[PDB]
DNA sequence: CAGAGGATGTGGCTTC
DNA sequence: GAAGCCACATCCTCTG
């Protein structure tokens, strides 16, 4: 799969698309990579961060690190960001010490995913 | 609230209960909230007549009604041939 | 076979 | 006015 940069250069994650609908089977499931050697078994949770509603509702939000690559069976975004607004979703790794990479402008969570707009 | 301007099911369905002349297709069943279903496929037909949706059937209209459960508008009378009931003590927090 | 239910497009309608 | 809502439409699936 394809990766993108982070706000901790020690870890990387999936290319979560521009704009999507409230609660869909993601078009590409979520991979989270450990460059720094991590005990394969450590837990990873995510929290949708936005100046508005700073904790949105998520499902299958917790995942297990395995072979230095934590993957999420199927993460789903329920709690909406707002108009033009995206999520700076936080990414936790439960270790000693635990570490996080902030991730600005992750994905726009609205009611319609961008359907080819109206024909009137 | 948006029931006013654009037509609903529950707002529409009860144009037919209250009106005596549509008992051909439905009726109030008892003192407590319940409702019977006369023609299961003439009902859906008129909801097509309003919605401009000629392909409409029971299976289609019905699904829409089964959404209502999780939102606390109405509920099912279990095992009864095509009979549910309205939750009003909730319609008024849903129009509070 | 009805009935609860996930998924996903649809059309009308407020909000920026 | 596209961008967010909304409340069905449509659909194919199980499992009581």
From Swiss-Prot, chain A:
- What processing steps or modifications follow its translation? Phosphorylated; probably by MAP kinases (MAPK). Phosphorylation by HIPK3 is required for the SPEN/MINT and FGF2 transactivation during osteoblastic differentiation.
What is the recorded phenotype of mutating residue 115 to Q?
In CLCD1; interferes with nuclear localization; abolishes DNA binding
Q: What is the effect of changing residue 110 to I?
A: In CLCD1; has severely impaired DNA binding and transactivation
Entry comment describing in which tissues the protein is expressed: Specifically expressed in osteoblasts.
- List the subcellular locations: Nucleus; Cytoplasm
Q: What is the effect of changing residue 81 to N?
A: In CLCD1; abolishes DNA binding
Q: Where is the Runt domain?
A: 1-119
Q: What is the effect of changing residue 3 to R?
A: In CLCD1; unchanged subcellular localization; decreased transactivation activity
Disease per record is: Cleidocranial dysplasia 1: A form of cleidocranial dysplasia, a rare skeletal disorder with significant clinical variability, even within families. Patients typically present with delayed closure of cranial sutures and fontanels with multiple Wormian bones, retarded ossification of the skull, shortening of the distal phalanges, dental anomalies including supernumerary teeth and eruption failure, clavicular hypoplasia or aplasia, wide pubic symphysis, vertebral anomalies, and short stature. CLCD1 inheritance is autosomal dominant. Metaphyseal dysplasia with maxillary hypoplasia with or without brachydactyly: An autosomal dominant bone dysplasia characterized by metaphyseal flaring of long bones, enlargement of the medial halves of the clavicles, maxillary hypoplasia, variable brachydactyly, and dystrophic teeth.
Protein's UniProt name: Runt-related transcription factor 2
**Source species, please?**
Homo sapiens
Instruction: Please name the taxonomic classification of the source.
Output: Eukaryota, Metazoa, Chordata, Craniata, Vertebrata
- What's the gene? RUNX2
Boundaries of the shown chain within the full protein: 111 to 230 of 521
UniProtKB/Swiss-Prot annotation, chain B:
Outcome reported for the amino acid change (mutating residue 69 to C):
In BDPLT21; loss of function in positive regulation of DNA-templated transcription
Protein's cellular compartments: Nucleus
- Signal sequence region: none
Residue stretches spanning the membrane: none
Domain of life of the organism encoding this protein: Eukaryota
Where are the annotated coiled coils located? Answer: none
Residues within the DNA-binding region(s)? 7-87
Q: What else is known?
A: Located on a fragment of chromosome 11 flanked on the centromeric side by the acute lymphoblastic leukemia-associated t(4;11)(q21;q23) translocation breakpoint and on the telomeric side by the Ewing- and neuroepithelioma-associated t(11;22) (q24;q12) breakpoint.
Similarity section: Belongs to the ETS family.
Disease the record associates with this protein: Ewing sarcoma: A highly malignant, metastatic, primitive small round cell tumor of bone and soft tissue that affects children and adolescents. It belongs to the Ewing sarcoma family of tumors, a group of morphologically heterogeneous neoplasms that share the same cytogenetic features. They are considered neural tumors derived from cells of the neural crest. Ewing sarcoma represents the less differentiated form of the tumors. Bleeding disorder, platelet-type, 21: A disorder characterized by increased bleeding tendency due to platelet dysfunction. Clinical features include epistaxis, hematomas, bleeding after tooth extraction, and menorrhagia. BDPLT21 patients may have mild to moderate thrombocytopenia.
What function is annotated for this protein? Sequence-specific transcriptional activator. Recognizes the DNA sequence 5'-C[CA]GGAAGT-3'.
Q: How does it assemble?
A: Can form homodimers or heterodimers with ETV6/TEL1.
Can you say what this protein is called? Friend leukemia integration 1 transcription factor
Q: Give the gene name.
A: FLI1
